[PDB]
């Protein structure tokens, strides 16, 4: 009852005459809704991981993934991936959300230098072949392909750049084969003193140890941004619910509130809106291009007017800032008071 809440707040068994601000009331949600795009085509993850032969590290392959559904249960079909490292997101079933664009980069390197595909690393790979941004957001998948790429006599299918004047900026590809001059005398396109060819071959051999077996690496880059999402997780939508305190998930935007009609003059390119406090106030329905308002469910403060407990046990309750027509009357266990 209100009196016992006063005692529990004051941490005392007797209460003096006065008014005490005990807690705040608020309406609990009733149901939950989810709204996602209705597309059904899947993303071409098959070709990226099932390619017959991968590209070189100094010239890596780049792929655009868009306008599809990215289900990550497919990746548990081939041999176990011995390395699954993600940055900015957890891979354990938290990858079922909406992204804006996806870049897929694939190459082949050695095992000992696999730890070089990471932010803030140094080495031949990091600054001469493939560099990652400091604020990287994505996942790197490394597995062993020693049975396929490596050969007894060594294959020259894969090469890496050893000499370069300056470090590579992140996501920059260099395919130049010009001689690396480092002395006064000209190189004239041939090697010699301070004249070098930047390209060197791995020459993988199965007889090599653990640190030299070839490894295939696929680097996935996402971009969580306010722009409309093309690729999304495999989730089921739900009918639109309005004028009820409900949960909602509009393309990954989770929240609790009330959705109603809006008079916002949304220009065709504008997706959602914001208020002065830089928080979401309006949203666009992904399936019908409808503009909906977000309003938090009813809330307020409660005070209890008590005479001294030595006098009486009756109390009065003051709902602060309520017009008395919206004072919460619902009983079916949906109030946080």
């Amino acid at each position: 009852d209100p009196l016992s809440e006063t005692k529990c707040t004051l941490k005392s068994f007797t209460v003096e005459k006065g008014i005490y601000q005990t807690s705040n009331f608020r309406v609990q949600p009733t149901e939950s809704i989810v709204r996602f795009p209705n597309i059904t085509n899947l993303c071409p993850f098959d070709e990226v991981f099932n390619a017959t032969r991968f590209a070189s590290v100094y010239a890596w392959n780049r792929k655009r993934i868009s306008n599809c559904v990215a289900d990550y249960s497919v990746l548990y079909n081939l041999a176990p991936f011995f390395t699954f490292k993600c940055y900015g997101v957890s891979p354990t079933k938290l990858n079922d959300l909406c992204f804006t664009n996806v870049y897929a980069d694939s190459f082949v390197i050695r095992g000992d230098e696999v730890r070089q595909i990471a932010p803030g690393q140094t080495g031949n790979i990091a600054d001469y072949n493939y560099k990652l941004p400091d604020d990287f957001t994505g996942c790197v998948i490394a597995w062993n392909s020693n049975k396929l790429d490596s050969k007894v006599s060594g294959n020259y299918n894969y090469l890496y750049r050893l000499f370069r004047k300056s470090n590579l900026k992140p996501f920059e590809r260099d395919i130049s084969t010009e001689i690396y001059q480092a002395g006064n005398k000209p190189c004239n396109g041939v090697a010699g003193f301070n004249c070098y060819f930047p390209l060197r071959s791995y020459s993988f051999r199965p007889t090599y140890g653990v640190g030299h077996q070839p490894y295939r690496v696929v680097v996935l880059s996402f971009e969580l941004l306010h722009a409309p999402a093309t690729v999304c997780g495999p989730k089921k939508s739900t009918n639109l619910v309005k004028n009820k305190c409900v949960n909602f998930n509009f393309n990954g935007l989770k929240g609790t509130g009330v959705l109603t009609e809006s008079n916002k003059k949304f220009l065709p390119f504008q997706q959602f809106g914001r208020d002065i406090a830089d928080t979401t106030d309006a949203v666009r329905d992904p399936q019908t291009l409808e503009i909906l308002d977000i309003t938090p469910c009813s809330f307020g403060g409660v005070s209890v007017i008590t005479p001294g407990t030595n006098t009486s046990n009756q109390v009065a309750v003051l709902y602060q800032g309520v017009n008395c027509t919206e004072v919460p009357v619902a009983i079916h266990a949906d109030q946080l008071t």
Binding site: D275, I276, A277, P296, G301, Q320, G321
Partner: peptide, 28 residues
Amino acid sequence: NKVTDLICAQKFKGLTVLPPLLTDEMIA
């Protein structure tokens, strides 16, 4: 007259304002 939405935006973050006990009529 000489001495004198943003309020609704603040209320939704948990910032509210209590009215004074003595109204302007009582103070006059």
